[PDB]
Design a protein around this ligand. Structure first.
Ligand SMILES: CCCCCCCCCCCCCCCCCC(=O)OC[C@H](COP(=O)(O)OCCN)OC(=O)CCCCCCCCCCCCCCCCC
Ligand SMILES: NC(=O)C1=CN([C@@H]2O[C@H](COP(=O)(O)OP(=O)(O)OC[C@H]3O[C@@H](n4cnc5c(N)ncnc54)[C@H](OP(=O)(O)O)[C@@H]3O)[C@@H](O)[C@H]2O)C=CC1
Ligand code: SF4
Ligand code: SF4
Ligand code: SF4
Ligand SMILES: [Zn+2]
Lengths: 208, 340, 156, 95, 63, 48, 114, 176
C-alpha cells in the first residue's frame, strides 16, 4: 500500500476527535452529532436554532479562533423531510485548521442569518436564496444574485429540471427579447451508468 | 401527405408545422412580418431575394436552423421562379412598389410578375397561392397603381382559380409608409390637403392583423378561391386622421387649403430624385382616395382575427417622431379622433 | 454602359474603404475575450489590418461576440447591437457564441447568439486561437469586398 | 461506386437518398450534396484473401500500436474464409 | 413560545415556479426499478425512484 | 515534404480544396439515415 | 404539528401583509408605465396585477403566503429601481405566445398531449 | 520565509534630500520611462506576417475532427460508441446497423462543432484510432448549419488531411 494508496494521517485524526469532543461537551444544547472522516475532516451537525450561538463561539473562543469563513453551501436531498442541508466551512488561521458545521431545514422554516458573525455570508446565503429557496431571517438585503431578473423557481433544487421552463429569443414584431416555452432541438440524452454490482462493502447499508 | 409534411410538436420554434412557404418579396415590411409569423411556428420558408444579401441579414434570426433558405431570383426569369417554387406547397405574393423606377414600371411589378409567379406555381403543382392586392383597386381609378393592381388581380384570378386574393385598405406599422409619411410631411411645411381632406374616408388596418389573417388563410382549407377584404374597425376622415397623428406625435398642426392640380405639380418634383422618392403624384392620388366599402367580401372577422384599433398602436408607431419634451407622455394623454 | 462601370468602381472604392477600416467594439464576456486580446497582442497585431478597438458602439463597425451569452445578458447585447450605426457586422466566435458550447442544455444560457442578433461569420473553437480569429476577420473582409450595393441599386 | 437517383441526387454508402416528393431537397438547390466517392465495402472487397498455414491466426490490422486490438481468428471451416472483426481482412488455411 | 399551529396539508405548488400545465397533466410513477436481466447484479434495485410519463419526441427537419 | 514525403494511399485527395464557405460548392448538412417507419400503402383496386 | 412562523402568527397578519403589498403595487404601476415607456394603459397594468394576485388565491398556509409576500416585495423593489428592462416587465404579457387549444377536440386535432 | 515589501525608510541627510528635490523639480523617473519607451522603439517587433507567416504549432494540436481509414480503404470505426459516451458536451451522435457484408459499421455519425469543446476525449477514447482531431483550424463558416458535420463531411476531412494526420500520429503515438 506504499506507492499508490494515499498515506494516512493519524495525529490530525486524534486531534480532531479530541477537539470534536471538546466542542460537543462545551455546547450540549445545540450539537447533535460529531464525526471525523477518514481523510481527517471534522463535521459538527448541529440544530438550526443554534446557528448563531455556535458560530460566534468558534469565532471568539481563545481555543478555536475560526476567524475566516471559507464557503457557505447548501445541499438538496429530497429523500428527507428536511431536504435542505446548510453547511458552513470555517478556517482558523491562528491554530491552522478547518472545521465544518452542518444544519438542516425544509422549504418553509426559516433559519437565522449569520451576517452578524461573518459579513462575507451577506452575499453567500443570499446566493442560497437565489438557488434553493431557503429564506434567511434577519438579513439586510435578500434578493436574487445570479439568475435572471424575471426568473421564477430555484434552479439548483433537484426537482428542477436541467433545462428551464422558459427560453429567450429575439422577436422583431415586438422588437424585444421574449420568453417562450423551451423546445430543445436535440434532447439531453440521459445515460444509465450505474454499475449493478456492489462496489464498496464497507458502506453496505443493512437491509430492512 | 408525405411523412416529412406531417406536423409535430407543440408549435414552437423547433417544431414542425408542415408549411413550405415561398414568400416572394419577403425583404420588405409585410414580408418581414409574415416571415416572422411563419418562422416562430417552425416552418420551412424559402426567401427569393433581389437586393443585397446584407439587407436579408435581418431575416436570419427569424426561424430555426435550416428553416429559411435564401436564394437569388429575377422577376423576368421564369427559370428562377420554377427553381424556387418546385417544392413548396404554399406560395405568397407580396411584390409591389409605391413608385415606378427606370427598369420597372407599374405594369412590370403588378401585372407581369404576379401573373408569371402564379403561372409557374400552377405548373409546378403548388396547391395554395395567395396574392396581395389593394382594396381600392379598380380599372377606372385615376392612379396607375390601382389600375395595374386591378388588372393584375384579374390576371391572377384567371390563371389560378384557387388563388386567395387579399385586399388590405392601408396598413400602418413600425416600418410602414402611411403614418410615418404623415408624420414626415411636417418638415416641408404645413401639411396641405385637398379641400382640407374632409371628404375622403379611410379605415387603416394594423399589420399584425393582416399577418394573422394571411396565416389563418394558409391554414384554412375553406379560404381557397375567395377574395377577402382586410379593413380596420373604425372609419375616419382624413383631416381627423392627420389631426390625431400630429396630436400623438405632439407636433403643431396648421393645415391650409391647396388645390388638387397644384398638389401633383410639387408631388412630381420630389419624384425626380434618383434614390427612393419622398412622394409622387400617385402617392397623392392614393392618399386622397376614399376607401370603398364591400360588405360582400369576407373580412378579418371571418378568419377569426379581431381588428386592432388605431388608438392602441398609434403611440407605438409614432413615439419615434416626438421631441424630447413629450417623449415620456403616456398613451392616454391624447384625445381620440371622431369616426364616421 | 459607362454608368455600370462607374457604379462598379464606386462600389469597389467604398468596399475597400469599409473593409480596410474595420473598427470593432471592446466587448468580451469570457475566455474567448482573452484569446481576442491575444489577437491584439504584438505577435498577431490586428492594427496592421486597420482593426482597432473602439469603446463606444456609435463609433464602431463590427461586434465580436466572444463568450457565453446568458439569459441575463441578452437584452444588453441586443441593445448594444441596435445602437451601432449601419453598416454593421457581427462575428460569432467560440462555441458558446455559436451553439451554447459546453452549456447548451443549461437553464440560463442562450443557445447561440444567432437567436438574438444576425451573424455574418461563425468562428468555431473553444477557444478558437488568435490565428483562427484573425483568419475569421480576413474572411469577413473578403465578404465585405464582394458586396454589390451600388450595382444592385443601379439594377433596381 | 456511387449510383444516381432518378431525381439526379447521389446515393451515399448508407443508402440515404431524398424522395421525389421530399421537400428537404430545397437545402440542395443552388448548392451541392456532400458525399464520399470512396466506398469502404468496395475497397475492402478488393483486398485479396491471405493464405496461411496455421489453424488459427492473429490479426492486429498492421502497424502494431497504430491498428486495432489484436484478435485471433479460427480457420477450421474450409468453405468460408475467416474475417477479422475490425479490419475486415480475410484469411484462409491453404490446406 | 415562538411556535404556531398549522393543521393544513403541505402545498409548495405556488413556490416551485412550475407552470400549471406540467402540474395538473403529469402523472408520476413511484417504483423500485426492475433488474436488468442481461446482468446478475441487484444493486440497482435498492432505492425507490420517481419518474414521469413520456411525452412526444419528434424528428428534427435538419439533422 | 521534398525530403520526407508522406505515405501515399489510394483514398487521399490529389487536389486540395481551400475554404469553400459562401461558394456554391459549400457543405450542406443532411441526415444520413433511412426512413424508420414504413407506412401502409392502400391497394389500387376498389372493393367492388 | 408545531412549526416556526416566518412573519405572520396566523392568517390575519398574512392577509394584512398581502393587502399592503397590493396597495404598494397599485401605487407603483403608473410609475412603471411612465418610466419604461410601455405602450399599454394603466388599467391594463392594474388588471394584470389583479390577475397575478388572484392566481395564488387558493393558498391557506401562513408560511407559503409569507414567502409569496416576500417574493412580491422583491419584485416590487426590482421594478421600483430600473433593474428589470422593458423585456422583463413585458414578460408578464405573453405577446408572442399563441393561445393553446382549450377544449378536447382541438387538443385531439393538434397533438397527443392531454 | 517572508519579506517586508515596501517598508524601507527614506534617508534624511542633505545630499539625499537635495537629490530627491532635484528629482522632484526636474522629473528624473519620467525621463527614465521615456528612455525605456525609446529603447523599445528600436527593437525588432515580434509581429508575424499572416497569412504568409503562420505561427508555430505542435504535433499534438487539437483542431478540426476527421475520420481515418485503414491502409486498405476500409474505414476504421466499428461503431463502439465510446466517443459519444465520453463526449462531455454530447456533441457526438452515433447510429449503427449491420451492413451488407455483416460488418459492424456506422450509419449516422454526427459531430456538432458548435457543441464541441475541442478537448480530445474522443480521439483518446477511440480504441481503433478512427476519430482524430486534425491540425486544421482555418475552417470558419458563414452559416450556422455548416458547422454541423455529418459522416460524409468527416470522411472527406479524413481523406483530405490523412497525409498530415498519419504523420502526427506517428510522431505522438509513443507518448500514449
Ligand atoms: C470613368 C472613370 C472613373 C470612374 C469613377 C471612379 C473613380 C475612382 C474611384 C476610386 C478607385 C476605385 C478602385 C478601388 C480599388 C479597386 C481594386 C481593389 O480592390 O484592389 C485591392 C487592393 C488591395 O488588395 P487586398 O485584397 O487588400 O490584398 C490583400 C493584401 N495581402 O487595393 C489596393 O491595392 C489599394 C487600392 C487603392 C484605391 C485608390 C486609393 C483610394 C482612393 C483615393 C481617391 C479618393 C479619395 C481622395 C481623398 C479623400 C479624403 C481623404
Ligand atoms: N401601404 C401598404 O403597406 C400596403 C401595401 N399593399 C401591398 O402589399 C404588398 C407588400 O407591401 P410591402 O412589402 O410593404 O412593400 P415594399 O415596397 O416595402 O416591399 C416590396 C418587396 O418586394 C420586393 N420587390 C418590389 N418590387 C420588386 C420587383 N420589381 N422585382 C422583385 N422584387 C421586388 C422588394 O425587394 P427589394 O428590397 O429588392 O426592392 C421587397 O422585398 C405590396 O404588393 C403592396 O402593394 C397593399 C395595401 C397597403
Ligand atoms: S467557447 Fe470555450 S473558450 Fe470560448 S467562452 Fe466558451 S468555454 Fe470559454
Ligand atoms: S473533442 Fe471533446 S467535446 Fe469535441 S467531440 Fe471530442 S469528446 Fe466531444
Ligand atoms: S470511439 Fe472510435 S470506434 Fe468507437 S464509435 Fe467512436 S469513432 Fe467509432
Ligand atoms: Zn485485423
Amino acid at each position: 500500500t506504499r506507492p499508490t494508496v494515499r498515506p494516512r494521517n493519524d495525529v490530525a485524526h486524534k486531534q480532531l476527535s479530541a477537539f470534536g469532543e471538546y466542542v460537543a461537551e462545551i455546547l450540549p444544547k445545540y450539537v447533535q452529532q460529531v464525526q471525523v472522516s477518514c481523510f481527517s475532516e471534522l463535521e459538527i451537525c448541529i440544530h438550526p436554532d443554534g446557528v448563531i450561538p455556535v458560530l460566534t463561539f468558534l469565532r471568539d473562543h481563545s481555543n478555536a479562533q475560526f476567524k475566516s469563513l471559507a464557503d457557505l453551501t447548501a445541499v438538496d436531498i429530497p429523500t428527507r423531510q428536511n431536504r435542505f442541508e446548510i453547511v458552513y466551512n470555517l478556517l482558523s488561521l491562528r491554530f491552522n485548521s478547518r472545521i465544518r458545521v452542518k444544519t438542516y431545514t425544509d422549504e418553509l422554516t426559516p433559519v437565522e442569518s449569520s451576517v452578524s458573525v461573518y459579513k462575507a455570508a451577506n452575499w453567500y446565503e443570499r446566493e442560497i436564496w437565489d438557488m434553493f429557496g431557503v429564506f434567511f431571517a434577519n438579513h439586510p438585503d435578500l434578493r436574487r444574485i445570479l439568475t435572471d431578473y424575471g426568473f421564477e423557481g430555484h434552479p439548483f433544487r433537484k426537482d428542477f429540471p436541467l433545462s428551464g421552463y422558459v427560453e429567450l429569443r429575439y422577436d422583431d414584431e415586438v422588437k424585444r427579447v421574449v420568453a417562450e416555452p423551451v423546445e430543445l432541438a436535440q434532447e439531453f440524452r440521459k445515460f444509465d451508468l450505474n454499475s449493478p454490482w456492489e462496489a464498496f462493502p464497507a458502506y453496505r447499508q443493512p437491509p430492512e | 401527405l408525405h411523412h416529412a409534411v406531417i406536423p409535430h410538436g407543440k408549435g414552437g420554434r423547433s417544431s414542425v408545422s408542415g408549411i413550405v412557404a415561398t414568400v416572394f418579396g419577403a425583404t420588405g415590411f409585410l414580408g418581414r412580418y409574415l416571415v416572422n409569423h411563419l418562422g416562430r411556428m417552425g416552418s420551412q420558408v424559402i426567401v427569393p431575394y433581389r437586393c443585397e444579401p446584407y439587407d436579408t441579414m435581418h431575416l436570419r434570426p427569424m426561424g430555426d436552423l435550416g428553416q429559411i433558405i435564401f436564394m437569388d431570383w429575377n422577376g423576368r426569369d421564369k427559370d428562377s421562379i420554377r427553381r424556387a417554387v418546385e417544392h413548396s406547397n404554399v406560395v405568397i405574393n407580396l411584390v409591389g412598389r409605391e413608385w415606378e423606377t427606370k427598369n420597372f414600371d407599374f405594369e412590370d411589378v403588378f401585372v407581369k410578375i404576379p401573373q408569371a409567379i402564379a403561372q409557374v406555381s400552377k405548373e409546378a403543382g403548388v396547391e395554395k397561392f395567395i396574392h396581395i392586392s389593394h382594396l381600392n383597386a379598380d380599372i377606372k381609378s385615376s392612379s396607375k397603381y390601382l389600375r395595374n393592381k386591378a388588372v393584375g388581380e384579374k390576371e391572377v384570378r384567371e390563371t389560378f382559380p384557387e388563388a386567395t386574393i387579399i385586399k388590405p385598405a392601408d396598413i400602418f406599422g413600425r416600418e410602414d409608409r402611411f403614418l410615418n409619411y404623415f408624420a414626415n410631411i411636417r418638415w416641408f411645411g404645413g401639411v396641405p390637403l385637398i379641400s382640407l381632406g374632409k371628404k375622403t374616408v379611410k379605415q387603416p388596418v394594423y399589420i399584425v392583423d393582416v399577418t394573422k389573417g394571411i396565416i389563418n388563410a394558409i391554414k384554412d382549407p375553406d379560404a381557397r378561391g375567395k377574395t377577402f377584404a382586410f379593413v380596420g374597425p373604425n372609419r375616419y376622415l382624413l383631416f381627423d386622421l392627420v389631426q390625431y397623428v400630429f396630436a400623438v406625435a405632439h407636433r403643431p398642426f396648421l393645415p391650409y387649403p391647396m388645390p388638387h392640380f397644384a398638389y401633383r405639380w410639387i408631388g412630381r418634383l420630389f419624384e425626380i430624385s434618383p434614390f427612393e422618392p419622398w412622394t409622387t403624384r400617385d402617392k397623392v392620388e392614393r392618399i386622397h382616395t376614399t376607401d370603398r366599402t364591400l360588405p360582400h367580401l369576407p373580412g378579418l372577422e371571418d378568419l377569426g382575427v379581431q381588428a386592432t384599433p388605431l388608438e392602441l398602436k398609434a403611440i407605438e408607431v409614432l413615439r419615434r417622431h416626438r421631441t424630447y419634451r413629450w417623449l415620456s407622455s403616456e398613451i392616454e394623454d391624447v384625445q381620440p379622433a371622431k369616426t364616421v | 454602359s459607362r454608368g455600370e462601370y462607374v457604379v462598379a468602381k464606386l462600389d469597389d472604392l467604398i468596399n475597400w474603404a469599409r473593409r480596410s477600416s474595420l473598427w470593432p467594439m471592446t466587448f468580451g464576456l469570457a475566455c474567448c475575450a482573452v484569446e481576442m486580446m491575444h489577437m491584439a497582442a504584438p505577435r498577431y497585431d490586428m492594427d496592421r489590418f486597420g482593426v482597432v478597438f473602439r469603446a463606444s458602439p456609435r463609433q464602431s463597425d463590427v461586434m465580436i461576440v466572444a463568450g457565453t451569452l446568458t439569459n441575463k445578458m441578452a437584452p444588453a447585447l441586443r441593445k448594444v447591437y441596435d445602437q451601432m450605426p449601419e453598416p454593421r457586422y457581427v462575428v460569432s466566435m467560440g462555441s458558446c457564441a455559436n451553439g451554447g458550447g459546453y452549456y447548451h442544455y443549461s437553464y440560463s444560457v442562450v443557445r447561440g447568439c444567432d437567436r438574438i442578433v444576425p451573424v455574418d461569420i461563425y468562428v468555431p473553437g473553444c477557444p478558437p486561437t488568435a490565428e483562427a480569429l484573425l483568419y475569421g476577420i480576413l474572411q469577413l473582409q473578403k465578404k465585405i469586398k464582394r458586396e454589390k450595393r451600388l450595382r444592385i441599386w443601379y439594377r433596381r | 461506386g456511387v449510383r444516381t437517383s432518378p431525381t439526379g441526387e447521389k446515393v451515399t454508402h448508407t443508402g440515404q437518398v431524398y424522395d421525389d416528393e421530399d421537400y428537404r431537397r430545397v437545402r440542395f438547390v443552388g448548392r451541392q450534396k456532400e458525399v464520399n466517392e470512396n466506398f469502404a465495402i468496395d475497397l475492402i472487397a478488393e483486398q485479396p484473401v491471405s493464405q496461411v498455414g496455421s489453424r488459427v491466426i492473429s490479426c492486429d490490422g498492421g502497424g502494431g500500436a497504430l491498428g486495432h486490438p489484436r484478435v485471433y481468428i479460427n480457420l477450421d471451416k474450409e468453405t468460408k474464409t475467416g474475417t477479422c472483426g475490425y479490419c475486415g481482412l480475410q484469411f484462409r488455411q491453404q490446406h | 413560545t415562538q411556535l404556531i399551529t398549522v393543521d393544513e396539508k403541505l402545498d409548495i405548488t405556488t413556490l416551485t415556479g412550475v407552470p400549471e400545465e406540467h402540474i395538473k397533466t403529469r402523472k408520476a410513477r413511484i417504483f423500485v426499478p426492475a433488474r436488468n436481466n442481461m446482468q446478475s447484479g441487484v444493486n440497482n434495485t435498492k432505492k425507490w425512484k420517481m419518474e414521469f410519463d413520456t411525452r412526444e419526441r419528434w424528428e428534427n427537419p435538419l439533422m | 515534404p521534398t525530403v520526407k514525403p508522406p505515405t501515399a494511399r489510394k483514398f487521399i485527395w490529389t487536389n486540395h480544396k481551400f475554404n469553400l464557405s459562401g461558394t456554391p460548392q459549400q457543405y450542406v448538412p443532411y441526415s444520413t439515415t433511412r426512413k424508420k417507419i414504413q407506412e401502409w400503402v392502400p391497394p389500387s383496386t376498389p372493393y367492388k | 404539528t408545531s412549526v416556526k412562523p416566518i412573519f405572520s402568527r396566523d392568517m390575519n397578519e398574512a392577509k394584512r401583509r398581502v393587502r399592503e403589498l397590493y396597495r404598494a403595487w397599485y401605487r407603483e404601476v403608473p410609475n412603471t408605465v411612465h418610466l419604461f415607456q410601455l405602450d399599454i394603459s394603466v388599467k391594463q397594468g392594474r388588471d394584470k396585477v389583479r390577475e397575478m394576485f388572484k392566481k395564488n388565491a387558493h393558498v391557506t398556509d401562513p408560511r407559503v403566503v409569507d414567502l409569496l409576500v416576500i417574493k412580491g416585495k422583491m419584485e416590487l423593489e426590482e421594478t421600483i429601481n430600473v433593474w428589470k428592462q422593458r423585456t422583463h416587465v413585458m414578460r408578464f404579457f405573453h405577446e408572442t405566445e399563441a393561445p393553446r387549444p382549450k377544449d378536447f377536440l382541438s387538443k385531439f386535432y393538434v397533438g397527443h398531449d392531454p | 520565509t517572508y519579506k517586508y515589501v515596501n517598508l524601507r525608510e527614506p534617508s534624511m541627510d542633505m545630499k539625499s534630500v537635495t537629490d530627491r528635490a532635484a528629482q522632484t523639480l526636474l522629473w528624473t523617473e519620467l525621463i527614465r520611462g521615456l528612455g525605456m519607451t525609446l529603447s523599445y522603439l528600436f527593437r525588432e517587433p515580434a509581429t508575424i506576417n499572416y497569412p504568409f507567416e503562420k505561427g508555430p504549432l505542435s504535433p499534438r494540436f487539437r483542431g478540426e475532427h476527421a475520420l481515418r481509414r485503414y491502409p486498405s480503404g476500409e474505414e476504421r470505426c466499428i461503431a463502439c460508441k465510446l466517443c459519444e459516451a465520453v463526449c462531455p458536451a454530447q456533441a457526438i451522435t452515433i447510429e449503427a446497423e449491420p451492413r451488407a457484408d455483416g460488418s459492424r459499421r456506422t450509419t449516422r455519425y454526427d459531430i456538432d462543432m458548435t457543441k464541441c469543446i475541442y478537448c480530445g476525449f474522443c480521439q483518446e477514447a477511440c480504441p481503433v484510432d478512427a476519430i482524430v482531431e486534425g491540425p486544421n483550424f482555418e475552417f470558419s463558416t458563414e452559416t450556422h448549419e455548416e458547422l454541423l458535420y455529418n459522416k460524409e463531411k468527416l470522411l472527406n476531412n479524413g481523406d483530405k488531411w490523412e497525409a498530415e494526420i498519419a504523420a502526427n500520429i506517428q510522431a505522438d503515438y509513443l507518448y500514449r
